[PDB]
Amino acid sequence: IATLAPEPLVEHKHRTLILHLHPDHPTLLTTRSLGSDANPTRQWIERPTTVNFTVTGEGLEYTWGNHPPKRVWAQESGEGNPHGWPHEVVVYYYNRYPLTTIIGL
Amino acid sequence: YEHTAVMPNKVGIPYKALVERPGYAPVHLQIQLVNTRIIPSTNLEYITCKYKTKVPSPVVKCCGATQCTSKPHPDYQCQVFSGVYPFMWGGAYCFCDTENTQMSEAYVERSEECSIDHAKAYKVHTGTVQAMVNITYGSVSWRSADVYVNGETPAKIGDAKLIIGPLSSAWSPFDNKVVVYGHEVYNYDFPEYGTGKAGSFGDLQSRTSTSNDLYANTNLKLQRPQAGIVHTPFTQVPSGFERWKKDKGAPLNDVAPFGCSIALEPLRAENCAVGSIPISIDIPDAAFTRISETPTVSDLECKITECTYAFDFGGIATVAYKSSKAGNCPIHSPSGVAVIKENDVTLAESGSFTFHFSTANIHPAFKLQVCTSAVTCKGDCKPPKDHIVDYPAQHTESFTSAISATAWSWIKVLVGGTSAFIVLGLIATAVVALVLFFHRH
Amino acid sequence: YEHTAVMPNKVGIPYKALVERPGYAPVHLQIQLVNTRIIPSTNLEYITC
Structure with missing residues (x-):
């Protein structure tokens, strides 16, 4: 019989997952992505910290302690208005596509 | 009737998919x-566990000398220490001062915990792929059976015959050499049963879990007994199985891409998502009806009431029909702009029904068929408020799906009006040559 | 559902108002x-009579 860590506080952002981890024992946190590049991270948490992970549309899977793994997918909420003046049309596609708007303009 | 496509x-x-005959x-x-x-093919090479060095009782020759033979034993050691004069309880052990012999023999044997926690060293060879496929068509319910992923084994599922084609990619998460410890696997190299660095991974290799032969190098060295007491002291480096169990990386089930969950007992790599699968299913003619039995429909007009950019089924539209007679016909959309939640419809005489769909476009120009008749749908969609969801996408994101109608008109004049202005500039040269030629004659 | 406005x-x-989910x-x-x-915070200085 092993200990169970307290569950983290989960708040969402645009393509960003924030976890508030408060452990009472040294606890392991491993994350991986469900795309072509897994990008695996691992660390031992001994103090109350906060971590930010970039969740894409392909997904992300994270385990915390002895809890079962959880999978999260990022939607396409965006931070702009696609119809209107071109001072806000451009800033809509910059957040969605920062790699094609700079090259394409 | 054979239906051939790519899944x-x-x-x-x-x-x-809608099958047309x-x-x-x-x-x-x-x-x-x-x-x-x-499921790859594996052959077990050797197992590894912590060792247990057991020493026999040394002999105490009083006035003489002793020699040893090379006994067949893994990591066997022998030595002779001269002039020991040991002391036990009840006085000294022997007469002869400053000449005596002690044996102090030691050898290495596997532990009794080797049958519980041991690391299995496997060599991986490429093998077969299989899957389980749920199938329904027409009006019969869902029923499933195990199929094989090759190009040579048809499977009888339902009344039809299904051939699941081979995978588009031969990608496998396993390496050539893997180590299975407990319920997780690792991508690790081997000392290949001949070598051993005595402290890293191969200080004790046995061919099976109960093999009589055993390889073991552990730097075991005999030490002289001190001050006239009877014991056999030795000196050796610590175990490599314990050192591997601390200096260990992440397992393959936490490292493997494409969401490959790894099981153990056939050593599978379940539920990977890579490539595509060709299909070939031969639906029998008993599930086919005629054109005369199915109703015909006309006066189809479509209006989208609400659409959403989000995942799951965020779109809902109502259509209006004028059917010849009541009955059931399926609905399907050929283009990949919108998927459809349900298959059939309970039609009536001059009514209307609603259906739920799912796009990844701001303006879906998708098209669906009802009772082998055609209609198109257009509309607008709004971005959602959810940032992170716990379910995967039901649609397919395309390249032109993100272009709004405002920005499409902006890029229709930066490439349309400018490139036609050069055409206006080029024909000015084409007409100034005609005027200058007419100056001559 | 969160609905923010100015009253x-x-x-x-x-x-x-009409919320729209x-x-x-x-x-x-x-x-x-x-x-x-x-409600401001007060401290009494003195009385007089």
Whole structure:
């Protein structure tokens, strides 16, 4: 019989997952992505910290302690208005596509 | 009737297709995956566990000398220490001062814990792929059976015959050499049963779990007994199985890409999502109806009431029909702009029904068929408020799906008006040569 | 569902709004104020009589 860590506080952002981890024992946190590049991270948490992970549309899977793994997918909420003046049309596609708007303009 | 198409390699989402036969009404075909296991071929090489060095009782020659023979034993050691004069309880042990012999023999044997926690060293060879496929068509319910992923083994599922084609990619998460410890696997190299660095991984190799032969190098060295007491002291480096159990990386089930969950007992790699799967299903003619039996429809007009950019089914539209007679016909959309939640419809005489769809476009120009008749739908969609969801996407994101109608008119004049202005500039040269030629004659 | 807006500082006049959750019917919302007290912090210096 092993200990169970307290569950983290989960708040969402645009393509960003924030976890508030408060452990009472040294606890392991491993994350991986469900795309072509897994990008695996691992660390031992001994103090109350906060971590930010970039969740894409392909997904992300994270385990915390002895809890079962959880999978999260990022939607396409965006931070702009696609119809209107071109001072806000451009800033809509910059957040969605920062790699094609700079090259394409 | 053979239906041949390409199914993407995904587990959760279903594949919807409408099978067209001339002279017969179309049917709705659904193919859904449940499992996708990649099973390589493995042969066990050797096992590893912590050692246990047991020493026999040394001899105490009083006035003389002793020699030893090379006994067959893993990591066997012998030595002779001269002039020991040991002391036990009840006085000294022997007469002869400053000449005596002690044996102090030691050798290495596996532990009694080797049958519980040991690391299995496997060599991986490429093998077979299999899957479990749920199948329905027409009006019969869902029923499934295990299929094989090759190009040579048909499977009898339902009344039809299904041949699941080979995978588009030969990618496998396993390396050539893997180590299985407990319930997790690792990508690790081997000392190949001949070598051993005595402290890293191969200080004790046995061919099976109960093999008589055993390889063991551990730097075991005999030490002289001190001050006239009877004991055999030795000196050796610590175990490599304990050092590997601390200096260990992440397992392959936390490292493998494409969401490959790894099981153990056939050593599969379940539910990977890579490539595509060709299909070939031969639906029998008993599920085909005629054009005369199915109703015909006309006066189809479509209006989208609400659409959303989000995942799951965020779109809902109502259509209006004028049917000849009541009955059931399937609905299907050929283009990949919108997927459809349900298959059939309970039609009536001059009514209307609503259906739910799912796009990844701001303006969906998708098109769907109802009772082998055509209609198109257009509309607008709004971005959602959710940032992170716990379910995968039901649609397919394309390249032109993100272009709004405002920005499409902006890039229709930066490439249309400018490139036609050069045409206006080029014909000025074409007409100034005609005027200058007319100056001559 | 979170719905943010700006209401005026009038007591008797209610604020009517219509929230819009996608995929769901709109729900009417009515907010009305009944009081508005500004309470400063005081320390007594002295009395006189």
